[PDB]
From Swiss-Prot, chain C:
The segment S4 is probably the voltage-sensor and is characterized by a series of positively charged amino acids. The pore-forming region H5 is enclosed by the transmembrane segments S5 and S6 in the Shaker-type (1P/6TM) and contains the GYGD signature motif which seems to be involved in potassium selectivity. Major selective outward-rectifying potassium channel of the guard cell membrane. Involved in regulation of stomatal movements according to the water status. Assuming opened or closed conformations in response to the voltage difference across the membrane, the channel is activated by depolarization. Conductance of the channel is modulated in a potassium-dependent fashion. May interact with the cytoskeleton or with regulatory proteins. Expressed in guard cell-containing tissues, in root epidermal cells and in root hairs. Detected in vascular cells of the root and shoot. It is found in: Membrane. The chain holds residues 309 to 615 of 820 of the full protein. A nucleoside 3',5'-cyclic phosphate binds at residues 78-200. This is Potassium channel GORK. Induction: Up-regulated under drought, salt stress and cold conditions. Induced by abscisic acid (ABA) treatment in roots and shoots but not in guard cells. It comes from Arabidopsis thaliana (Mouse-ear cress). The potassium channel is probably composed of a homo- or heterotetrameric complex of pore-forming subunits. It comes from the Eukaryota.
């Protein structure tokens, strides 16, 4: 058998039913009844054979060692440890001792040793340890449930012990025995032995609960000195147990709920607000802001520390994939770039009337207003009433300030409750430099909304100079790649859209460099690309000059 | 408030449990056997309602007060378990009150 | 006593909180409930570490890390650094992590920001392929290092690593490694030599040997080219940052032209003066054999010729 099994699980529920039944039953045989009836002796042997089947299953459990944190199914070690832990104690109880009692003439020693069966309560407590493991139930609530159960069990055991001690006394001195002379009401329990088992069970348990709840009630009191000493111990135990119950109940509710903390802040904040007497919209603005910050803080921290990058990546993918796909700028680029952007995203919520960054400051994050409406303005410290295209849901902003490295050419302000995406400069720049193809795609998108978006058209000069520099460095890159062969790389950059017509700063066209190196394959590839054969360098050198200089007949012939 | 209402309903159900038994064996049930301070009201039905209400309610919140003068006992087996349950629930509820005030 | 509580109590409380939050996010109960559970148990040990590290004035923790982390890295043949002064800094920014079986650390083809050293435990490293079947190039072991070579290469590192046994790994941010490298360029050269030794020594790096050779061939090309371009435009900040990043001003482009040549033909003065402070050479001959003086007098800037 193996722990992760349906039949195993269905086994332990019956095991715990039998366990609680026997746990309660053990006092029933020890007290309120000398010996056992053959009627229940049959149920006794049924329970004992059930415990034998349990111990057989106990032989092979394949439990997981705590140090390893990995399950081990090897039989010998599981036996060596787990059998020592529990089977040895179980074995003594497993033998049914009612037969030994009858064989020994009901010798008191056998009855004393009969208590061993009580040891099985460990299975019950292990069951609640597993109950506690469940996330759904509150930890302190589970603890108080444990205390209530344990208190009830202890009280019942004491009630049974009370009658066992009473019967232990010789039958002649019925008066001196407590149950013999308690005389509750007109009726007198003159003979404890002849009266029904339940009639005595009810009275004994009532005495124990009277002490447990600390209401003395007068009424029954311990008469026997043997009875007297036991009461002392019982009440001493009960006091501390009830004290633990008090402490746990206090601690469960001393932890203020999120709603409780929020309401406390509402109380003191409305008190202050009433001191000023401003009232109106302001009360609403602070209340909304504070509840929103609690909700956002709930989101942020668990991402920050609880969940690792690889793990958070998946939930980020599921939560944000449509959000990022919808954005037009990110459309038209490879999937991996989109995923990389998604898996380093953040979460932001905002209220009306807040500025995230002012005009002229150095931008430090890349933002996307996924939800809500936002107003972008060129209002600045010097000047006012300057506004530009309002940003709608699923629109990116701040990309120009980062790509073009311009420090906030305008002031960006939110105008109602909005959902915003935050992402840093460093990671974004690294992703861009890794994936230039996606970078050009996005920049071509930027060209696309040019002369269609007022904000982009206003800043379009920076994008123009940026694409000029990008094309220059791309020409240098393709020249370098052509230098060290890289026929496949050159083909790939042709598929990437790189223009072979563009030249480097020296005027060294790709054909110029192919002739200088002498790679006829590169020369013919550029020829069939369509670039004009006659070209000039900084000094005006035609590719024929370098073709003759290098000395290969192939390039000269082409 | 919920605690007080629970006490009142406990007193009412307790008097009903006393009424459960027939007129015979009046001594066996708790009422009619007290004989506190020479009143000895054996025939509870004859007694006016208000005093009976007072006596039952007194016992209910005396058990509730975790004090227990012991004038009144749950002598009969029938209601005997009722005080058990009532006091246990009372223990939990009083503990909850202590926790709330401590908070 | 009860109100004071225990770390177990906070453990369960945070369990309840983010489990409720995940349930409000409607995430699949089969997909991540176990993974959160698995990592959650290992976090129990490390919460004490978090509390101490925030509490401590950061020097004593440096000493304790020196006591423990230094031996582990010294054991690792990878990332020795061939000097001990350099390694202790790595220790004082180094962080640690535990794991569970059947757990994937790094996904294939992702920019790596965390550097993992197998101080203890057994790992398996596999490469994605067009078929998609996993091929384990190597089985990693205790006191090894993976992903550092990727940062050296700058490659996307299309590698998946799965734990094979109980393991202790060290998590390092990429930025700290970059900073320590820029502080010690020579130690970067030494680790490059160590890596080129492992390429023969180890199968995974031998698998990546084609990439190592090509990008080393490639990497030099952009470095010489980029500085020359930044000299051509004249943007002094970018070029000086690049030249202090470790670029060699004496390295030449594909045509042999130096950044000094481009600065002179452009005629910018401060770039030329800075390169003079860098000890740049003038006797350098291009394919056409141009010297900085020649194009300096060709373009027509008096300052560069005068200098």
């Amino acid at each position: 058998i193996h722990p992760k099994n349906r039949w195993y699980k269905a086994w332990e529920m019956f095991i715990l039913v039998w366990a609680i039944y026997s746990s309660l039953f053990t006092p029933m045989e020890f007290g309120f009844f000398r010996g056992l009836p053959e009627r229940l002796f049959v149920l006794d042997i049924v329970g004992q054979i059930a415990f034998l089947v349990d111990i057989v299953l106990q032989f092979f459990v394949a439990y997981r060692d705590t140090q390893t944190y990995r399950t081990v199914y090897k039989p010998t070690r599981i036996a060596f440890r787990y059998l020592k832990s529990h089977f040895l104690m179980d074995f003594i109880g497993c033998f049914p001792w009612d037969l030994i009692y009858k064989a020994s003439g009901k010798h008191e020693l056998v009855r004393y040793l009969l208590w061993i069966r009580l040891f099985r309560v460990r299975k019950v407590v292990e069951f609640f340890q597993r109950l506690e493991k469940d996330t759904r139930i509150n930890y302190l609530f589970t603890r108080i449930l444990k205390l209530l159960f344990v208190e009830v069990y202890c009280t019942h055991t004491a009630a049974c012990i009370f009658y066992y001690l009473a019967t232990t006394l010789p039958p002649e001195n019925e008066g001196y025995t407590w149950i013999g002379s308690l005389k509750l009401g007109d009726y007198s329990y003159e003979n404890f032995r002849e009266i029904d088992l339940w009639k005595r069970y009810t009275t004994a348990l009532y005495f124990a609960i009277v002490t447990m709840a600390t209401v003395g009630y007068g009424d029954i009191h311990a008469v026997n000195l043997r009875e007297m000493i036991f009461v002392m111990i019982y009440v001493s135990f009960d006091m501390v147990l009830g004290a633990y119950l008090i402490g746990n109940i206090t601690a469960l509710i001393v932890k203020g709920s999120n709603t409780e903390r929020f309401r406390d802040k509402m109380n003191d904040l409305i008190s202050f607000m009433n001191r000023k007497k401003l009232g109106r919209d302001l009360r609403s603005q602070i209340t909304g802001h504070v509840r929103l910050q609690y909700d956002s803080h709930y989101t942020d921290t668990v991402m920050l520390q609880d969940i690792p990058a690889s793990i958070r990546a998946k939930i980020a993918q599921l939560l944000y994939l449509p959000y990022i796909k919808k954005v037009p700028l990110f459309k038209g680029c490879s999937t991996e770039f989109i995923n990389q952007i998604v898996i380093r995203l953040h979460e932001e919520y905002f209220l009306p009337g807040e500025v995230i960054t002012e005009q002229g400051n150095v931008v430090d994050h890349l933002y996307f207003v996924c939800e809500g409406l936002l107003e972008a303005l060129v209002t600045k410290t010097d000047g006012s009433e300057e506004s530009v295209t309002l940003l709608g849901p699923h629109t990116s902003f701040g990309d120009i300030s980062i790509i073009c490295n311009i420090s906030q050419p305008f002031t960006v302000r939110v105008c109602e409750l909005c959902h915003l995406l935050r992402l840093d400069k460093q990671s974004f720049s690294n992703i861009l430099e890794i994936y230039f193809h996606d970078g050009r795609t996005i920049l071509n998108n930027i060209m696309e909304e040019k002369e269609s978006n007022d904000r982009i058209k206003k800043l379009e000069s920076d994008i123009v100079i940026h694409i000029g520099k990008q094309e220059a460095e791309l020409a240098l890159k393709v020249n370098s790649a052509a230098f060290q062969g890289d026929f496949y790389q050159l083909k790939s950059l042709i598929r990437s859209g790189a223009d072979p017509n563009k030249t480097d700063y020296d005027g060294r066209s790709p054909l110029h460099l192919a002739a200088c190196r002498g790679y006829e394959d590169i020369t013919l590839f550029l020829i069939q690309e369509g670039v004009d054969v006659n070209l000039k360098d900084k000094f005006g050198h035609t590719p024929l000059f370098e073709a003759v200089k290098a000395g290969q007949e192939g390039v000269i012939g082409l």
